[PDB]
Design a protein around this ligand. Sequence first.
Ligand SMILES: CC(=O)N[C@@H]1[C@@H](O)[C@H](O[C@@H]2O[C@H](CO[C@]3(C(=O)O)C[C@H](O)[C@@H](NC(C)=O)[C@H]([C@H](O)[C@H](O)CO)O3)[C@H](O)[C@H](O)[C@H]2O)[C@@H](CO)O[C@H]1O
Ligand SMILES: CC(=O)N[C@@H]1[C@@H](O)[C@H](O[C@@H]2O[C@H](CO[C@]3(C(=O)O)C[C@H](O)[C@@H](NC(C)=O)[C@H]([C@H](O)[C@H](O)CO)O3)[C@H](O)[C@H](O)[C@H]2O)[C@@H](CO)O[C@H]1O
Ligand SMILES: CC(=O)N[C@@H]1[C@@H](O)[C@H](O[C@@H]2O[C@H](CO[C@]3(C(=O)O)C[C@H](O)[C@@H](NC(C)=O)[C@H]([C@H](O)[C@H](O)CO)O3)[C@H](O)[C@H](O)[C@H]2O)[C@@H](CO)O[C@H]1O
Ligand SMILES: *[C@@H]1O[C@H](CO)[C@@H](O)[C@H](O)[C@H]1NC(C)=O
Ligand SMILES: *[C@@H]1O[C@H](CO)[C@@H](O)[C@H](O)[C@H]1NC(C)=O
Ligand SMILES: *[C@@H]1O[C@H](CO)[C@@H](O)[C@H](O)[C@H]1NC(C)=O
Ligand SMILES: *[C@@H]1O[C@H](CO)[C@@H](O)[C@H](O)[C@H]1NC(C)=O
Ligand SMILES: *[C@@H]1O[C@H](CO)[C@@H](O)[C@H](O)[C@H]1NC(C)=O
Ligand SMILES: *[C@@H]1O[C@H](CO)[C@@H](O)[C@H](O)[C@H]1NC(C)=O
Ligand SMILES: *[C@@H]1O[C@H](CO)[C@@H](O)[C@H](O)[C@H]1NC(C)=O
Ligand SMILES: *[C@@H]1O[C@H](CO)[C@@H](O)[C@H](O)[C@H]1NC(C)=O
Ligand SMILES: *[C@@H]1O[C@H](CO)[C@@H](O)[C@H](O)[C@H]1NC(C)=O
Lengths: 322, 320, 322, 163, 163, 163
Amino acid sequence: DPDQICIGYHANNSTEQVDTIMEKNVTVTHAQDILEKTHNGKLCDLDGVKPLILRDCSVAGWLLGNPMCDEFLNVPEWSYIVEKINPANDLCYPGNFNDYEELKHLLSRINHFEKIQIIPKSSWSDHEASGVSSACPYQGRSSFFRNVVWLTKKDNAYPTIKRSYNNTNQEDLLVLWGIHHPNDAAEQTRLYQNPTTYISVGTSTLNQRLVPKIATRSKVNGQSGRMEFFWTILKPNDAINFESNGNFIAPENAYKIVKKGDSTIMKSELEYGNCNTKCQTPIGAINSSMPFHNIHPLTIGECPKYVKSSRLVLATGLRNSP
Amino acid sequence: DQICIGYHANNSTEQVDTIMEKNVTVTHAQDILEKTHNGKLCDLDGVKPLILRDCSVAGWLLGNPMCDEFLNVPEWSYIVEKINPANDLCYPGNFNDYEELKHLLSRINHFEKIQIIPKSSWSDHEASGVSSACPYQGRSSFFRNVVWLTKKDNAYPTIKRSYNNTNQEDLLVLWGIHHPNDAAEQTRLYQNPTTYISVGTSTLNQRLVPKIATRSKVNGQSGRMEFFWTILKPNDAINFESNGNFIAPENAYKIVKKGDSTIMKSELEYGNCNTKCQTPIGAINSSMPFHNIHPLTIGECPKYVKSSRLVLATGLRNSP
Amino acid sequence: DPDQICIGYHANNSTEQVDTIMEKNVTVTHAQDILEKTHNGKLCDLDGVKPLILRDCSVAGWLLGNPMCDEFLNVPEWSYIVEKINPANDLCYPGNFNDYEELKHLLSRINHFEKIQIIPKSSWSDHEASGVSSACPYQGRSSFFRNVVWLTKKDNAYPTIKRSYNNTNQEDLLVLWGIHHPNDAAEQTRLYQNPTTYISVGTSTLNQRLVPKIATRSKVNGQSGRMEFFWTILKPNDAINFESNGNFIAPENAYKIVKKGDSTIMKSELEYGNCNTKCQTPIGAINSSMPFHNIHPLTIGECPKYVKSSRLVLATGLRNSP
Amino acid sequence: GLFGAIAGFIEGGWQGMVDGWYGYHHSNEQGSGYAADKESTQKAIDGVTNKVNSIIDKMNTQFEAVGREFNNLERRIENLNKKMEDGFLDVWTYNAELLVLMENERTLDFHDSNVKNLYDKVRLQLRDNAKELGNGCFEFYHRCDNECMESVRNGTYDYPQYS
Amino acid sequence: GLFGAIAGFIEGGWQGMVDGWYGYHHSNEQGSGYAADKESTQKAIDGVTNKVNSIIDKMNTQFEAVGREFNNLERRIENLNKKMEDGFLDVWTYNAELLVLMENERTLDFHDSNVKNLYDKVRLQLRDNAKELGNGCFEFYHRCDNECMESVRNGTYDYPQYS
Amino acid sequence: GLFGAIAGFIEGGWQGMVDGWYGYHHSNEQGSGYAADKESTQKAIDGVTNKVNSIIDKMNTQFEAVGREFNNLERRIENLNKKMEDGFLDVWTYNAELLVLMENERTLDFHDSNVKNLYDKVRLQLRDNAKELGNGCFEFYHRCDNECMESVRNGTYDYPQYS
Ligand SMILES: CC(=O)N[C@@H]1[C@@H](O)[C@H](O[C@@H]2O[C@H](CO[C@]3(C(=O)O)C[C@H](O)[C@@H](NC(C)=O)[C@H]([C@H](O)[C@H](O)CO)O3)[C@H](O)[C@H](O)[C@H]2O)[C@@H](CO)O[C@H]1O
Ligand SMILES: CC(=O)N[C@@H]1[C@@H](O)[C@H](O[C@@H]2O[C@H](CO[C@]3(C(=O)O)C[C@H](O)[C@@H](NC(C)=O)[C@H]([C@H](O)[C@H](O)CO)O3)[C@H](O)[C@H](O)[C@H]2O)[C@@H](CO)O[C@H]1O
Ligand SMILES: CC(=O)N[C@@H]1[C@@H](O)[C@H](O[C@@H]2O[C@H](CO[C@]3(C(=O)O)C[C@H](O)[C@@H](NC(C)=O)[C@H]([C@H](O)[C@H](O)CO)O3)[C@H](O)[C@H](O)[C@H]2O)[C@@H](CO)O[C@H]1O
Ligand SMILES: *[C@@H]1O[C@H](CO)[C@@H](O)[C@H](O)[C@H]1NC(C)=O
Ligand SMILES: *[C@@H]1O[C@H](CO)[C@@H](O)[C@H](O)[C@H]1NC(C)=O
Ligand SMILES: *[C@@H]1O[C@H](CO)[C@@H](O)[C@H](O)[C@H]1NC(C)=O
Ligand SMILES: *[C@@H]1O[C@H](CO)[C@@H](O)[C@H](O)[C@H]1NC(C)=O
Ligand SMILES: *[C@@H]1O[C@H](CO)[C@@H](O)[C@H](O)[C@H]1NC(C)=O
Ligand SMILES: *[C@@H]1O[C@H](CO)[C@@H](O)[C@H](O)[C@H]1NC(C)=O
Ligand SMILES: *[C@@H]1O[C@H](CO)[C@@H](O)[C@H](O)[C@H]1NC(C)=O
Ligand SMILES: *[C@@H]1O[C@H](CO)[C@@H](O)[C@H](O)[C@H]1NC(C)=O
Ligand SMILES: *[C@@H]1O[C@H](CO)[C@@H](O)[C@H](O)[C@H]1NC(C)=O
């Protein structure tokens, strides 16, 4: 019957749980999840810009112009690059790409090339420029890389080559060339006539002299021969000078670096998702206002911070009485 | 009449630290830091380590004659090498990509050494070169697993050999080149003055050329030998061609057990003991979550920290 | 009328603010700043030892003796080394310095060299030993590096050189030499007579055999030729043996490594400050009792700990009432 | 709880108070009901909101892994690169999890504190004019009408008037 | 401590209380003895046990150094490698030591709170029927035999009957 | 604050008390003045001085960046080096900022706790012999002399005398 006043606190039907150091699974009236745990399982445009999806082609295969990669002969601007773990279409003619990983690292800061013809096939009068291999088929006929040219002897003669290119453009130029390593001495003379050869390359900074390596090697894509490729960045107004008396796989096209920016090479088996996002990972895009996520540690865009947690939940309310 | 409220006090002198106060006496505490080890190199969970004693990995693998103890070592848990092993390259020179090779070793528990090119197959070359640099029983000898080919009948015809890895395991193949002191020694040993060694696999495309140079004597010799290695995949083949200076394979190593291993640098030798957790200065038998013995451990170990002391309060402030 | 005793707490005129997790800008009676935010803008001696300020010279220019770097022919003991971002006097004759970054890394552990002669000019009876280039001007005329010598043919002959130096000193010795890469074969015979050449170098550990590279190259500082320099550390009682029949840039002077300790190479545009400190930064010196600072991450000396914080203040006193 | 009020001397919470986190139940002649204490509730909202934002903002300059590639004879630096990136991911993962745990504990004790301080606000006002039941309630000696009840929540209860 | 009980209004601890961390000391016509409050002692052990275990589990994915070797011309990466590994060792050593220091403080305060809360549990039940001594004790006005001594420990003291 | 005293039931601090952090205001027929409590003020200075020292000493071992140079075909390791050093700087910047925020919170609460315990020390000595106003003051039933007031600060208030 007498009047009274009581002090108390809020309870509700919440079953939300949080953890503390001294106690787990504490029921609270309110809690705030701060961990994004879901993704759309797709590769998307990044803030309106489509990526470069290399499909079955490698970076090497793309840049050298493996015939199987004609899809990527003059790609438009990209937001990022996707490459499979082991692309099928790489060096069709076997060998290697020198400092390949350092070249890939450059791409991570590039969004666009304008590929240009710097030395036309038609300009080789005293040499054959039409060399092909069954290792690089195109529509079932032997072919060769599109951006370089396999030079061989003409009328049992390989006169010493001397060609220069001056980068009269305003952009840095990525230039590619290579050397052919034959199987034996008989092959050497059959292709190039001269038994002892070299390729020398010079710019303002590059000072290269390559000598072929004759050796009997195991067949790869039908070939025991190898081709070894090289690259440099030719500055505006610098010139590149090639000299050779054999084994020279010469440039045809080179790439103007027209757009530098943030990019990356993701390894993913996924295909293009016809979709747009602000945060992309190799296994899916993220659309979240959460401050953390646990999707994948490699992301690009405006993203939450990655953590390995299976669960992050902050108490906001108080301990809820059952 | 009177009910009092109070708390446990005891005779404890165990002390703990907090932000605001050091050396706080409490009724109960718990040390969580292992501070002792047994000072020994032990078997890791029943599996003995490979103690290389005075031999280096290089001396072991190439077959330095002072390392004959390790001609066919059993399966190991970890590898122990001294800081500066006396028995390394007996014939002076270097091992190409040596550190990368030792990195692979850290994931290998066992090799099975096999012959891949018998001495008998050298019809047109001498295959018994030796040096006072590689004494066996104080007499001139050579590495056991590679062969020093020299001219025969004042001739060194062009060598051409293949070995196809028909085994099921990856194969570690080793070979070398000899760098002579002068043009006269070149002709004396190999006859031909301008020589090469080409080596090819599915991935390797190597051409080595020797380097005459005037050099300081090491182990009595001014000549050098440079050694190379590759991993030969099942069903791949390796192709050697040479017209001089070739230190050719005799034996190679099947990689028959991959797993967790390491190369510890330690001057200790075998402790005839067993442990679940091993460091280069000794082994740990403990249920503490932390230890400060040494940062490089192998096995099931507490977590390492540089601390000298780590004690959690469990009980309460102990009044005197 | 009735007597009273009250419990209370200190207040004052302090306007000092600190932060907590739940509350920013909390005014407190006492606080302690623990972050140093000021420096003197100068390069100073470190605890009485002056730095080596290379002014417009690079480490390469210094050690090889670019003629514009004569200021540094015999520098005294230093505490740290200061280099500009793009020093004008580097390799006057263009080319490159092999393992340059690894050499600079050794410099970080050295405080003093004593330079010494290892091969006098008087030993070149059968070669010319005064080759110079307009790429290495000094007082408006063609000159050359001071510490190495450009050998060329004499009386239309270049006999094979054999030279040894035994390190009879107690200290390790930094030895430098180079190779000249010419423009064409005509130049090769014009300078050295022998058309096919080499340089062989050996010690107890070194086993080198260099061969020059003709290649057509862009002019840098007027020259299309290049010079490539090498170095090694020669232990006491070991010896180095050079042999060459052309293209050899020979040692004249080498550097005894006389004092080893803590040092570093700072990149800075600042000049000497006529000033002393116990903690130095490429941007200015620090004199402070604060345990932390935010001046620059690269410091040498007795320094506070660097953080990127703009502010760090500990509360010591209590919440101050208005 | 550290401060002994939540699930302590006040045995349980009120589902009837949908209004704020802490507050009052009154019963008198005119009726009965719940009312949130707005000051303490607003204080708690601000502090908790600040805490949540602090935690997010402190992590804002976190480590961000980058894809790097290495060839077959760069295994040592590939392993170095991998353990470095994992190393930081493990550091930041730990920082986030521990911070959340530590602050969850403080947040629950903060609520406990606020409830105890609200109880003491009322106790110190009423003094001898109400009996302290020991369960969070005060039993008045005099009759406290709605205006009198409002004054207790205002912090404007006039003790001289009733003793 | 923060709660003012341990080495506070209760001057010191009891050697006689072997059977628990917190408890009672009664004295009536029948006799006197120490009795440990199981509810609070148990809560304490659970809380403390969970704290220790959590501290261990958070550090259970921590940095593990790996021997890597480098040659004479790989000094930069060798140094990079060494600084990276020392870096993580220092970070994890800091985390470990700091967490122990912070949680040792919270542990001692936890006990203090538990003793304070226990005292109030007794106080709030008794009210007028006992006199607050101030040393952590209550002198009864009405005699309390060994049955009501158990009811106050049980938490089942009927105030109305004694006043 | 957590303990309800500072900016709580004691509404403000005193400019008048220059002599220490916590203390007393008295009023008797002789005169009225300010007296700091030595023991509690000193305890607080020790704990706060230690806290500061502890924070510094835990950060005395910590990452130190080193200038490393790389050439045009070592961009990957250069990048790796950069991210590694930035990585540790960020970790340590976080460690410092966060520890200060957390310890600042605790420092203010520590002061609040100390004020409260001091209020309680006085309260428990007086009991009946003074009136609890609720604002931080104790209105005396009897007349407390200059001597009487000093026994309170000593902690030697003879209660049996005045009742
Ligand atoms: C007459 C003729 O060319 N027939 C073709 C067969 O050669 C071919 O069989 C493959 O032949 C491979 C080697 O031949 C090529 C090649 O790679 O395709 C022929 C190229 O024209 C030649 N290109 C140049 C510029 O010389 C190329 C080159 O000489 C070497 O690669 C240099 O190392 O050699 C090889 O033996 C394969 O194993 C074999 O299958 C068949 C089937 O594709 O088609 C015929 O038209
Ligand atoms: C006559 C004779 O040979 N006597 C022996 C001495 O040779 C030897 O003194 C050492 O001689 C070294 C050079 O000799 C070898 C060697 O390395 O030991 C002899 C090897 O049979 C020869 N092997 C081959 C396959 O050619 C080897 C080889 O030519 C070089 O190593 C290639 O660089 O040369 C050298 O001069 C030492 O300084 C010297 O001590 C003594 C010492 O026990 O024994 C004599 O029987
Ligand atoms: C023309 C001439 O012989 N000497 C003077 C020129 O130096 C100079 O014009 C420059 O000529 C440069 C090439 O000539 C040098 C040089 O680098 O300066 C002349 C050096 O004596 C010679 N040194 C040696 C040891 O042989 C050097 C050397 O052959 C090459 O560097 C090896 O590659 O060549 C170059 O073309 C410059 O572009 C040009 O300006 C003029 C005044 O400028 O006076 C000439 O008398
Ligand atoms: C809790 O109450 C809400 C109504 O506000 C309801 O949506 C929710 O389902 C309830 N939880 C249950 C029934 O478990
Ligand atoms: C609560 O924690 C337990 C173990 O502590 C866990 O197994 C469980 O999944 C958690 N939540 C549940 C059952 O909803
Ligand atoms: C490239 O072209 C311009 C003239 O069009 C010239 O100034 C420049 O020297 C050339 N670069 C080189 C390296 O020859
Ligand atoms: C207590 O700490 C002091 C310094 O704070 C230290 O020297 C000593 O080792 C500790 N206690 C004992 C009993 O040694
Ligand atoms: C090695 O032998 C296998 C089985 O006979 C064969 O199929 C394979 O092609 C050989 N490898 C090479 C590289 O020739
Ligand atoms: C604040 O007070 C101190 C002494 O109590 C005095 O020295 C100082 O000048 C004052 N500052 C201001 C701005 O009033
Ligand atoms: C107080 O904090 C606010 C942001 O909350 C800031 O804008 C203001 O400048 C701070 N006062 C300072 C730094 O004196
Ligand atoms: C260098 O000279 C010293 C001093 O006589 C001698 O002992 C040493 O063998 C020599 N070393 C070489 C490599 O010639
Ligand atoms: C740093 O500053 C103080 C105060 O101006 C000055 O007196 C002292 O000499 C300086 N210390 C050094 C090492 O330069």
